[PDB]
Structures are given as structure tokens and as C-alpha cells.
């Protein structure tokens, strides 16, 4: 189901489930990830995560919020955003790179610049992915099998996930 594929991508952005995407969906996601890792909002890494999340919101709103009211409806996403995301996925993933870079920093619990598969799964659950599925997705992100999930793995995976195939 092509339509269900679309709905899945919408749900990932609609973190609070209320049928439209707001800046608050993104800030709420940042809040939940910081809480999962015990990283303070006011810390350098906390500020970088909120900043990246806000930038991703602006990137999505720029593509999808066609009436300018700073809510992206299901209709706006389905009728507008899907094609545009499919047509320019790498450019969209670049708008997410500050968020994704900041998220890696949050999930690096020992400070060595690397993130485990297990901690990648924790991040995904903070973003609403059920625990079993999150383990499966985290594992799939480790494309070279060294047990670590890095930026060169997550940025193209993000680009691919938001390319809803026809
Ligand atoms: Ca919402
Ligand atoms: Ca709202
Ligand atoms: Ca701030
Ligand atoms: Ca709108
Ligand atoms: Ca680490
Ligand atoms: Ca978890
Ligand atoms: Ca559990
Ligand atoms: Ca399972
Ligand atoms: Ca890896
Ligand atoms: Ca590697």
C-alpha cells in the first residue's frame, strides 16, 4: 500500500498524533530524546538538538506548508510534500543534517564520537518507534557491521526513508 507508506512518513513527523505537523512536534521529539539520554536542555548538546530540530521543521514547512499557517495538514503532506520529498530527497536530508548530527552527540554516552546500535534503538523509541521495531531498524542502520551507527549511515537512510517509493 502506497497510501499506507505515505501515512507512516506523516506519523513519524506528527509526533503528538494530532493530525497536523507543528514546530511543537519537533521540539517535543527533541525533549523526549534529551530525557531518554539524561542530557539537559540548557547544555551545549541540548541547545544544539533544539536548534537542529527547529531547522528541520523550517525545512519541512518550506516544502509542505503551502497556506503559511505554520501547521502542515495531512492533506498538505499527501498532496504536496510526498512528491517534492521524492524528487529532492538528498536536499531535504541536508536540511536535517544539523538535527541528525546533534542527535548523534546526544546518543554518544561515553564521548568518543561514536554511537552504539543499542543507543540508536533508544533514540528511535524516543521518536515513537515501538521497542521491537526500533531494535530492527537500529540494526539495519549499521551497514558496515562494526556495531556503531554514524552520520554517514543515518543521513542517507533518512533521505531514503522520506522517499516514499511509488
Ligand atoms: Ca502534531
Ligand atoms: Ca497544532
Ligand atoms: Ca535556546
Ligand atoms: Ca498549512
Ligand atoms: Ca560513544
Ligand atoms: Ca527504548
Ligand atoms: Ca522494554
Ligand atoms: Ca521482533
Ligand atoms: Ca556502522
Ligand atoms: Ca563503520
UniProtKB/TrEMBL annotation:
Annotated positions binding Ca(2+) 1: 14, 16, 18, 20, 25
Keyword Protease among UniProt keywords: no
Residues noted as binding Ca(2+) 6 in the record, renumbered to the chain: 125
Entry binding sites for Ca(2+) 3: 47
Binding site for Ca(2+) 7: 131
Annotated keywords: Calcium, Metal-binding
Protein name: Calcium binding protein
Residues bound to Ca(2+) 8: 132
Keyword Calcium among record annotations: yes
Binding-site residues for Ca(2+) 9, renumbered to this chain: 142, 144, 146, 148, 153
Residues noted as binding Ca(2+) 4 in the record, renumbered to the chain: 65, 67, 69, 71, 76
UniProt binding sites for Ca(2+) 2: 20, 22
InterPro entries membership: EF-hand-dom_pair (IPR011992), EF_Hand_1_Ca_BS (IPR018247), EF_hand_dom (IPR002048)
EF-hand domain span: 1-36, 129-164
Pfam assignment, any one: EF-hand_8
Annotated GO MF terms: calcium ion binding
Source organism: Streptomyces coelicolor (strain ATCC BAA-471 / A3(2) / M145)
PROSITE patterns registered for this protein in UniProt: EF_HAND_1, EF_HAND_2
Annotated Ca(2+) 5 binding sites: 108, 110, 112, 114
